[PDB]
């Protein structure tokens, strides 16, 4: 069965950059901030080939369409920008919505602090991100879609492993 992943986060945090870094192993073109799209990708993970569909969301407004995306997704990447405190503050409210939609099942998610290459304009500490991940009961990663630092491929692979584990 295909693993269905959805990426959420405030506009501008780097959702589209992260997805394209995962799919193409580079980041060389800017991408329309308003475009929402789904990508299919096959990867060998551990022994086997796994098919995934990844939804790169654009508008973050709380709508019936957004609830549909949350019902569709099996695993979620919540992204913030380490240079932007406001984006970090949107993460827990997103989780609360997801919890309600996936009830009675547990939500499978990861927390990603992107733009780690901008350490000099950092507003959110690595420690704060770790503590928030603890509050979400999920794995935490800092990375840079721009530089590729942070092992973005392994981040997605590990979310696929978790989705599949929880399926039983
Ligand atoms: N310095 C830096 N800029 C980034 C990184 N990821 C994305 N960006 C930039 O941040 C802006 C928003 O990225 P985008 O992928 O469109 O964010 P989205 O709105 O969440 O899809 C663009 O100007 C990107 O070039 C990163 O890791 N480091
Ligand atoms: Mg985008």
UniProtKB/Swiss-Prot annotation:
E.C. code: 3.6.5.2
Cellular-component GO terms for this entry: cytosol; fibrillar center; nucleoplasm; nucleus; plasma membrane
Tissue: Detected in heart, brain, placenta, lung, liver, skin, kidney and pancreas. Detected in estrogen receptor-positive breast-derived cell lines, but not in estrogen receptor-negative cell lines. Expression is decreased or lost in a significant proportion of primary breast tumors with poor clinical prognosis.
UniProt GO BP: negative regulation of cell growth; negative regulation of cell population proliferation; response to hormone; small GTPase-mediated signal transduction
Catalytic reaction equation(s): GTP + H2O = GDP + phosphate + H(+)
Keywords for the protein's UniProt record, in alphabetical order: Cytoplasm, GTP-binding, Hydrolase, Nucleotide-binding
Main location (coarse class): cytoplasm
Residues holding GTP: 9-16, 56-60, 114-117
Keyword Thylakoid found: no
Induction cue: Up-regulated by estradiol. Down-regulated by tamoxifen.
Main enzyme class: hydrolase
Domain of life of the source: Eukaryota
A GO MF label: nuclear estrogen receptor binding
Subcellular location: Cytoplasm
Annotated function: Binds GDP/GTP and possesses intrinsic GTPase activity. Has higher affinity for GDP than for GTP. In cell lines overexpression leads to a reduction in the rate of proliferation, colony formation and in tumorigenic potential.
Family in the record: Belongs to the small GTPase superfamily. Ras family.
Record's protein name: Ras-related and estrogen-regulated growth inhibitor
Origin organism lineage: Eukaryota, Metazoa, Chordata, Craniata, Vertebrata
């Amino acid at each position: 069965a295909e693993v269905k992943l959805a990426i959420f986060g405030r506009a501008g945090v780097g959702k589209s950059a992260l997805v394209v870094r995962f799919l193409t192993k580079r980041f060389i073109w800017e991408y329309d901030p308003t475009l929402e799209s789904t990508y299919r990708h096959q990867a060998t993970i551990d022994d086997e080939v796994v098919s995934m569909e990844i939804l790169d969301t654009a508008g973050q407004e709380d709508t019936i369409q957004r609830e549909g995306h949350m019902r569709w997704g099996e695993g979620f990447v919540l992204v913030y920008d380490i240079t932007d405190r406001g984006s970090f503050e949107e993460v827990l409210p997103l989780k609360n919505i997801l919890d309600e939609i996936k009830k009675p099942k547990n939500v499978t998610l990861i927390l990603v602090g992107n733009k780690a290459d901008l350490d000099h304009s950092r507003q959110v500490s690595t420690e704060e991100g770790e503590k928030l991940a603890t509050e979400l009961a999920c794995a935490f990663y800092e990375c840079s879609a721009c530089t590729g630092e942070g092992n973005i491929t392994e981040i997605f692979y590990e979310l696929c492993r978790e989705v599949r584990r929880r399926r039983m």
